[model samples]
Target: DSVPIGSLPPVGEVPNRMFAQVVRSNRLGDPIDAFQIEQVDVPKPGEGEVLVAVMAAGLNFNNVWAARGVPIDVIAARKAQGSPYDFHIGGSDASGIVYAVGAGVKHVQVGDYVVVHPGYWDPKAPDVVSVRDPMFSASAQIWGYNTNFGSFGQFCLAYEHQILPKAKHLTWEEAAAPTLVGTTAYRMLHGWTGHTVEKDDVVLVWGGSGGLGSQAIQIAREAGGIPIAVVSDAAKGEYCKSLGAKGYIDRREFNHWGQPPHWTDDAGQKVWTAQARAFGKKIWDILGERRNPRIVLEHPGEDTIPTSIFCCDTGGMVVICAGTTGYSAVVDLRYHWVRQKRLQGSHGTNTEQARAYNDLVYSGRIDPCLGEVRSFLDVGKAHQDMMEGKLAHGNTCILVGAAAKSLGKQ
Candidate 1:
């Protein structure tokens, strides 16, 4: 039988109803109206998981992508990935308190103040503590994307490893804004991977005023590395400067769109290679030194990837997490292979890394960069801004259960 469109066959069981922002499928064209609020079922936590009463949740670009069902057809992908429903409850980062814990769970108790980590760890999987193991060796999954329950709603289901202590000095909104982006930046800069940034190293950061790049800049500064920001304009450049970046490159002056989408385009590849060096020359001049970049912190792929490879100093690395612009990245191999530049892929941080990052927030050593804060009712609008590319400058946070601030203060 042909499966009904936009309908999902139940994989497990769920409750009657609760409030949630749900996305059905790609059939809905624009994400602005696609994320609609409905009284959906409140879920029960399975063994080794805990239910969190979300106080505040952070907005990310992935929510827009998930709602639009782009890059991957989310509706079909959800079912294949084992979601009991085609719909998704879409926020990833949250600062909340434990509402309940399931069987076999220990360490976290009810009413414990916490920041829910977005990555879910399964006990049955091997301890792929680092990426060096077989890439598929780990059982870690992103809570909202890979599983049913996520942090957008009033409640979320989290594994034991996903709950970290909320920093005592931070507000619920502040703590909520940092987890996903901060962890991603941490992994990219200081992960167990050998390509960690070094002191005084020049690191070119794409999307420098935005979520991941903002956090990456902070991480770079704290590590004593110099962050050279790539911002769309001067205002955003100052934003990066406020975050401690040492130099700035206005992306408006240097565009890479004409580069062909395939590696087979030798002529276009040469053109892109030259563009990369040209951009690098500007970077070097800004630094007042001829220092080749030791690292390129990137997430904006395709539009700037060829430039990423061509501009990377010999033996330096281009660390990437997501390809936001478009994914068909065709790099110029001569510049990459001949220069000995390496490309490293990073994902969500591990449990150990999360704990340490939380500590950084806790001590006020690392600050949260929330561009805007909105009430739960405005979550969709906040996401729409992200979707339209208007607020690509920084993070937007949503206040969920907490009617006001100090909801999680000790």
Candidate 2:
């Protein structure tokens, strides 16, 4: 490719080579900052690592969380050298050119069109997936978006396993899909009770338009489960079905636990649970799948906690992948004990699960209903779109590959 000299970025031919780097602390949403982009010297890859020219980056709800620091641990709460905690974040799903592979790095070479998995797995750890727990690719340890692998810029990076080839037919934006929201849903769906979605099971999802929720709904369909989407507005109904939702329920029509924007600690316990009971009963009445309904795809903790618990079938399981509304989840022992219902905190899935997830995506059985694809020059608007909660649907991702091509000629 040939380019006019005027089109090149003003990389000081000699003096400075610092590139922009964005982090969670820099973006605006809540007062809590989770992601930001700034300039730094291009990093040299270490052994088993690779430096990639991020042609594209994926967006997710966790990006909002990283930009808006909560639980304070991933980037806020830190620990000393001997301690267990070290907080930091960036972006999640990234696909780009492997410009440089470090010495001893064999998984990929220069010029591979790869999607960085971001989340790592080790058969060695007691519960490695849980320990690594990549939320929308935002692992508490090393995530993406503004959490694990911030691919929003010209040059993004990661280790060997974090980088893998995606289908050559897909565009950069498409390649980023399976990794960001799609991967989150995959891990959560498979993580719950180790029961993969079955044709007979019916799955219910709150915040069905949001990152994990949207993916959860589609994932259910791919897994052969009937999907019932719970939405905030009716406008998202058609979009939800496009994402494989079998039905839609508007949350605003009824009163439930947790008020908006007050996602604190003592969340799901008192208010949310009470409301969940009634809401759960309603769902049960409409979609009576008998034996506990198999699974519930839930997040938005505290605010919708009770509803999640109440709505799921007795003896059925509610999987808590995250607490977007609030971290706390309150459970009623009498109902749980008498009904014998179960709740599981899902963190990550095994290697086979990851492979299966990627495979499903490659086969096109699983689709990530991306909300918007904006030019890189206008990427900030995409970020704001997610923050405003005003997008036509919930999923919002950066269209960096288009942005990267404009720069590639330079």
**Candidate 1 pairs with clashing backbones:** 17-40, 18-40
Error of 2 at 53 (Å): 1.5
User: Which lDDT values do the candidates have, in the order given?
Assistant: 0.77, 0.59
Candidate that would win on lDDT: 1
Write the residue-wise lDDT of candidate 1 on 1-410 in tens digits. Answer: 11121121232222344566677774454666777776666677888888877778888877777777766756677688576776778788988778778898879988788997666667546565544532234566666766667777777788888899998877788889988988888878887455788888888899898888888899889889899999888999999999989978898886565345467777866776576678889888978988888899988887878778877889989998888777777677877899898898878877777787778888887888877778777767877877775764677787877778555566
Off by over 4 Å in 2: 1-18, 24-37, 68-89, 120-142, 145-149, 259-278, 281-292, 348-351, 378-381, 401-410
- Flag regions of model 1 displaced more than 4 Å: 1-17, 73-75, 126-139, 258-274, 405-407
Each prediction's TM-score against the native? Answer: 0.88, 0.77
User: Best TM-score goes to which candidate?
Assistant: 1
Q: Residue 399 CA error for candidate 2 (Å)?
A: 3.4
